[PDB]
Design a protein around this ligand. Structure first.
Ligand SMILES: NC(=O)c1ccc[n+]([C@@H]2O[C@H](COP(=O)([O-])OP(=O)(O)OC[C@H]3O[C@@H](n4cnc5c(N)ncnc54)[C@H](O)[C@@H]3O)[C@@H](O)[C@H]2O)c1
Ligand SMILES: NC(=O)c1ccc[n+]([C@@H]2O[C@H](COP(=O)([O-])OP(=O)(O)OC[C@H]3O[C@@H](n4cnc5c(N)ncnc54)[C@H](O)[C@@H]3O)[C@@H](O)[C@H]2O)c1
Ligand SMILES: NC(=O)c1ccc[n+]([C@@H]2O[C@H](COP(=O)([O-])OP(=O)(O)OC[C@H]3O[C@@H](n4cnc5c(N)ncnc54)[C@H](O)[C@@H]3O)[C@@H](O)[C@H]2O)c1
Ligand SMILES: NC(=O)c1ccc[n+]([C@@H]2O[C@H](COP(=O)([O-])OP(=O)(O)OC[C@H]3O[C@@H](n4cnc5c(N)ncnc54)[C@H](O)[C@@H]3O)[C@@H](O)[C@H]2O)c1
Ligand SMILES: Nc1ncnc2c1ncn2[C@@H]1O[C@H](CSCC[C@H](N)C(=O)O)[C@@H](O)[C@H]1O
Lengths: 255, 211, 255, 255, 255
RNA sequence: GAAAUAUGUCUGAAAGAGUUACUUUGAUAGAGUAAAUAAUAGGAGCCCCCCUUAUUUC
């Protein structure tokens, strides 16, 4: 039961974040879609109901995340859960000898800033709010669920920056799970595989169908509702901490 | 029966305490034992002082959130250091505490140092987590009241005392407490413990009960 | 929910298996405890209710597991989940120079036979019995949940054989997740850390307090109810396949 | 340098073990090929030189390994390194619904016994033998190098038993490293990918060409000389311990 | 043999980079220390001989790395190895509830830029230089060896940013190993544990001594010569690719 | 000018529970070897009263 828990979901206006917000609000929890101003997340917040609000913020900026967290605290009084689903994907080979093209450092920097720096910024700014809370029966003061990727374990070609950011999240899951262990904040990570959401619009449709056929079982793109289900299960279980869960369907990405 | 772990719990406990102390040396809160009272103590007074420092550092070593104990002003050639080395033996170089000859005023801001002494008038309202607490290692068999204070004022440090009477019915007894008792009290206050729990380490003979 | 699902649980008369059976039966499922004849599991099955049955079996024996599966099919007509919680523990040093004592081969062999060979025997037989299930909406015919240990990753001194068996389970989780993917069966593994079951609670209270302190958060021994909750979450999520979940509370086993 | 070291190589009569023995003897070391009596290892031992001796032993048998180690001590006076390269493979699906065929338990048990149980038996007996060695300048009394497979991590369909055994070796690499750390024996694991050995050479040239194409780089089957080079590098480095090295050329075995 | 090669070593003026440069130059290869201008690497270049040169550059600045690589090409006309050892460490807790102190975002950005962004910048700018090389008889054009930490796998308290950067390096090791596989560049990562280099000057002496005593075997701080030896072994082995090697001594860190 | 208690880990009539160091401990480590503790605030004559020391009732 997640009745009454307040969850701050970053990138909640689209894909996995929106699916998680939908499932959490549908079960009584509160939601604060911490998303970009132009993402059109206010419409999603209006659709979800009064329990859900929209915070226009860029996770790469400290001031925006602080404003969103202040809004969440004012509206609901607590931040009992955090979901870091805000990220971007860029496909670009490190170096293309035939075409003489070298990965632009700007793309790598932007991908890291949005994914890894953004996730750490949200974690560090929501840790304070979750630490001002009072421990429940068990000492817990909150839970943080990051969104890594299977690109952090078996990344494909032209996926170096994305894999770098997701591997950073995977690596820093445990150090942060030990920094906040005295407080009582659990920090988990989810490494989803191939999921059906706008992030895949860039990939060619034929490539997407082939990949969906390549998943051992179920041979389909993961439903975002399944990511939301795993997030809820992680929130409910008080003994899941400092761990990465591959929600990929047994797919291992070949070169 | 079926056993999961080898019976090596003492080694494992000491290793885990070492890991926690290593973390505390980095991100823990300083606690100072000011070894500068060699002049006042006699032979037996110094023997206890060292024994109480041993027991205190043992209590803090096993805590859940250990301090970062500083042995400030610990003269290398003095009798304090000599007896500490004799008692600890090969462990003196493995202890995870900062033993330094520089006075605590040389290691921390003078605005973050509070010297704990009963002779101080100010009482310790709440245990602050951004301060340093100086526990002057000492045993006053031949009472010299106002020593730790006098030296705290000389160094121009703030002073405080535990609220012994405000939460206990002392009646008659020596207000000063043994270093191990003080460190246990401060470890209980540092872990969201109320004064009632913290002051349970006072000897029972010194007070009839709480208030 | 899990209403109408039939679960064959090995090691179900004690600890994690018993907790899993309790939760599943209380959620409306059916359970088939599969433990040794002298395990006292008949009392647990009687206590659980009519939905739960007990079959005296040895996971290391093909015939006994076959008889247990036949009993499950006769009683409920369907096997929809398998939970391989049946295992033993053995602590002994590979070699002790001072005592001049060498690890016995029989200890290693029996630890492998119970933890690893028995687990695979149950997996293959229950996969055979799950092939007869009509695929559900998603094409899924069953879920098999093994039970590795965090030792499999960072086993301590004297945990050579236990760690070997658990690492074997962890390694073979994915090969079997791919073997049975065409059938539609899902294979998952849970690697619990320190859990408050008869394997540790029988230790001296000082030892148990130390082990509890070892966990970063929650600073306590694991609750078997948490293992049951994770098992249910795995059962409910269709996109969790071929993955190992460390249910250990961020504890990395000490050297 | 590796001049003067005595190395007990299991399964050295053929494949990776033979390449390791060749390189070690060529560098000036000594070799004790510990393979099956009907393996042709006598001819290889004669070919290598007087420094190399063949000892017919079955790693799954304690008595045979004890006799082989006694012969090694008698011929060379000590054991300074051990290379567990003996093992077998089995191809069999856990369950094939179309054929109605289930994995035989005998195959799983046999693969386990040969690979994992054999490796452990050799490891423990070699630890006993090498404990008597006087510590060298760094305190090291020996080195033990196990052979795993990438099947331990990325296993393929019909590779349940092989993956289980290799995962067991990977799991027990660290517990044994901690067991033998006070003695001074270093335990390491090598996870080769695809290698041009009889395990793969006997296959038709079509599949061998396909596999050579699979490896991202070098786009060929692994050279056993490179496994021998890695083993020598592990022997020479005194600070490599309790670690698995994937010598596979960046290939991630697809389903 | 490594004679005649040219290696661009970033952060080669101190610690592991200097040890690697020393070993390579002593073995006969050339060396280009790509360290900060204020690092005092010119003295090291003079001390190493005429083979080694000092290239003042900042790995976080694209222009500086380009100029250093151009200088390396002009002096030696070839780049056969690129050793990324330039990095920094920061110890700061994610959140300190007791002191009410939260990790600064500038610290996280600094660590990321220096370690992860710097390593990727060097990799991408040296892949161009190594793509001009004529492929060897085996098809190899060069080797890029990154430096990671065991923090990438299990960081301790107050190690979130460093662990994030090292985990990013570990994650992107394989994607870049696959990007450059067509052009025959091997990308490998080394994950050292504790080593006696100036990076530990921040740590208290007693903490360093304790951590050293906590290495199972050898029970002491790692020797940079061992890191140089492993780098050489990676350079000499053509079948090592897309892998992380933990050169830590079996030490697993704790909170 | 009279009266009081006054345990430097705690409890106390010797003793019990605690403290420190070393033992890689086969399930009683539920332990061994070695430190610390054998004038009850400091000293005296003989539990007994004597001065001093920190408190406290006219
Ligand atoms: N789509 C997949 O199958 C898949 C697989 C693995 C991992 N992921 C990761 O899961 C997460 C979910 O993404 P998705 O699949 O829903 O794609 P999406 O584009 O629908 O969701 C990404 C969200 O991030 C938001 N966002 C981006 N930058 C932001 C910023 N600076 N501040 C605030 N919000 C910002 C976007 O507005 C959007 O709402 C992403 O981090 C993605 O990288 C996705
Ligand atoms: N207890 C822990 O902290 C912990 C931690 C990690 C992993 N595990 C593993 O979790 C599993 C759950 O066991 P547990 O912790 O409840 O201990 P347990 O002994 O209470 O449960 C083991 C069960 O297996 C049964 N069993 C044993 N051998 C059998 C056999 N040959 N055939 C059939 N049944 C057999 C026993 O009768 C018992 O019911 C075990 O495999 C254990 O190793 C336990
Ligand atoms: N070939 C590969 O590419 C590859 C990949 C990953 C792992 N492996 C492992 O590498 C090892 C080497 O195999 P290989 O490729 O050299 O093939 P191989 O068949 O040449 O090596 C196996 C050797 O083990 C010996 N052997 C088998 N059972 C034995 C027993 N009971 N007692 C003693 N000796 C015994 C055989 O006689 C033979 O000499 C095996 O353990 C294999 O599983 C191989
Ligand atoms: N020291 C350890 O035990 C340890 C363990 C694991 C990983 N590492 C990693 O090993 C690497 C080597 O560090 P070390 O131990 O030799 O310490 P070090 O400080 O001696 O090495 C760092 C080097 O990088 C150079 N450098 C720093 N920032 C730079 C920049 N922006 N541009 C160019 N050069 C720059 C420094 O001048 C120095 O020469 C680091 O990346 C470190 O994170 C070290
Ligand atoms: N009631 C109390 N309030 C504050 N600090 C106290 C205390 N009792 C003991 N302490 C601490 O414990 C130490 C040993 S007590 C020795 C007291 C001596 N009169 C002096 O001049 O300090 C004292 O120095 C003080 O740091």
């Amino acid at each position: 039961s997640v009745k009454g828990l307040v969850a701050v979901i970053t990138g909640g206006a689209s894909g996995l974040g929106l699916a998680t917000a939908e499932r959490l609000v549908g079960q009584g929890a509160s939601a604060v879609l911490l998303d970009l101003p132009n993402s059109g997340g206010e419409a999603q917040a209006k659709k979800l109901g009064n329990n859900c609000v929209f915070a226009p913020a860029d996770v790469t900026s400290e001031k925006d995340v602080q404003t969103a967290l202040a809004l969440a605290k004012g509206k609901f009084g607590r931040v009992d859960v955090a979901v870091n689903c805000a990220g971007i994907a860029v496909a670009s080979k490190t170096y293309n000898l035939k075409k003489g093209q070298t990965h632009t450092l700007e793309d790598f920097q932007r991908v890291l800033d949005v994914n890894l720096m953004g996730t750490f910024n949200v974690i560090r700014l929501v840790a304070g709010e979750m630490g001002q809370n009072e421990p429940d029966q068990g000492g817990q003061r909150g839970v943080i669920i990051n969104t890594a990727s299977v690109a952090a374990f078996e990344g494909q070609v032209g996926q170096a920056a994305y894999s770098a950011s997701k591997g950073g999240i995977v690596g820093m899951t445990l150090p942060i799970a030990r920094d906040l262990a005295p407080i009582g904040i659990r920090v988990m990570t989810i490494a989803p595989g191939l999921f059906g959401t706008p992030l895949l619009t860039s990939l060619p449709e034929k490539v997407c169908n082939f990949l969906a056929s390549q998943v051992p079982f179920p041979s389909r793109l993961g439903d975002p509702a399944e990511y939301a289900h795993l997030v809820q299960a992680i929130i409910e279980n008080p003994f899941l901490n400092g761990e990465v869960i591959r929600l990929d369907g047994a797919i291992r990405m070949q070169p | 029966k079926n056993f999961l772990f080898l019976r090596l719990w003492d080694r494992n406990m000491d290793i885990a305490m070492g890991w926690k102390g290593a973390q505390a040396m980095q991100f823990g809160q300083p606690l100072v034992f000011d070894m500068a009272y060699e002049n006042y103590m006699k032979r037996k007074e110094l023997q206890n002082t060292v024994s109480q420092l041993l027991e205190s550092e043992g209590w803090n070593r096993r805590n859940v959130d250990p301090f970062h104990i500083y042995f400030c002003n610990l003269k290398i050639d003095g009798a304090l250091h000599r007896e500490l080395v004799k008692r600890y033996q090969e462990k003196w170089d493995k202890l995870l505490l900062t033993s330094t000859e520089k006075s605590h005023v040389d290691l921390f801001p003078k605005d973050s140092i509070i010297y704990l002494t009963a002779d101080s008038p100010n009482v310790m309202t709440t245990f602050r987590h951004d301060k340093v607490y100086v526990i002057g290692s000492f045993v006053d068999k031949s009472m010299q009241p106002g020593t730790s204070l006098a030296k705290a004022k000389r160094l121009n440090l703030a002073t405080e005392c535990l609220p012994l009477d405000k939460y206990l019915q002392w009646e008659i007894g020596n207000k000063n407490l043994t270093l191990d008792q003080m460190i246990r009290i401060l470890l209980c206050l540092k872990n969201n413990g109320n004064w009632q729990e913290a002051l349970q380490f006072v000897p029972k003979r010194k007070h009839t009960g709480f208030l």
